[PDB]
Amino acid sequence: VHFTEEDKATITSLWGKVNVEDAGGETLGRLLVVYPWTQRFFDSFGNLSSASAIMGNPKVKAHGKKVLTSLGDAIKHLDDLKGTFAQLSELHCDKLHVDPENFKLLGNVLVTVLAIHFGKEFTPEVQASWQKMVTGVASALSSRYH
């Protein structure tokens, strides 16, 4: 990864302000609602048939938290995304066979959720730093494929 100095500062700063308990379930729930094929990987989670069903689903909320918690941990070492996600890559690639395009989709949904929460503070420049994070996380998670 080639995060600029500014990118790293922007990502670290904004993350410290994030309501992870809320944005986690928001992010995964929205992914499931907006891109219904992603539900294929979450059979055991129960009723995922609509926005209402998905957004009130306890398992979705709990799992979304874990996803964003993992992102927060990666943010502690932005020069080392590949290492942070190495074991997660083996899980998502070798075991679950998720197409890499979906890592980008989840990241883009997170970006929209950050925009909801931060409003005008989520400037086009701030977004561009987060889009690099999305691409970097996706690449790190895709490492086992190729």
Partner 1 sequence: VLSPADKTNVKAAWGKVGAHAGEYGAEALERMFLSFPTTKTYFPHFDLSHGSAQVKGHGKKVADALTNAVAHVDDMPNALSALSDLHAHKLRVDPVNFKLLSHCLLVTLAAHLPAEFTPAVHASLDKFLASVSTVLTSKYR
Binding site for partner 1 (CB under 8 A): 26, 29-30, 33-37, 39-41, 51-52, 54-55, 97-99, 101-102, 108, 111-113, 115-120, 122, 124-125, 127-128, 131, 145
Rounded to 5 degrees, φ, ψ at 97 are 55, 45
63 appears as a binding residue in the annotation: yes
DSSP H stretches of helix in the chain: 5-15, 20-34, 51-55, 58-75, 81-84, 86-89, 101-118, 124-141
- Tell me the C-alpha distance between 38 and 52, whole Å: 17
Please count the residues of this chain forming the interface with ligand HEM, following the rule CB under 6 A: 20
Residue 52 CB, nearest approach to a copy of itself (Å): 35
Please give the residues from 63 up to 82 whose contact with a copy of itself meets the rule CB under 8 A: none
Please give the residues from 53 up to 82 whose contact with ligand HEM meets the rule CB under 6 A: 66-67, 70-71
Nearest in space to 41 (alpha carbons), one of 108, 110, 105, 97: 97
How many other β-carbons are positioned within 10 Å of the β-carbon of residue 92?
Answer: 22
108 binds ligand HEM (CB under 6 A): no
Residue 49 CB, nearest approach to ligand HEM (Å): 17
Q: Per-residue x/- marks for a copy of itself, 78-117, CB under 8 A?
A: ----------------------------------------
Distance set, CA 138 to CA 17, 48, 50, 56 (Å): 23, 25, 27, 27
For a copy of itself, the binding residues (CB under 8 A) are: 1-3, 132, 135-136, 139, 143-146
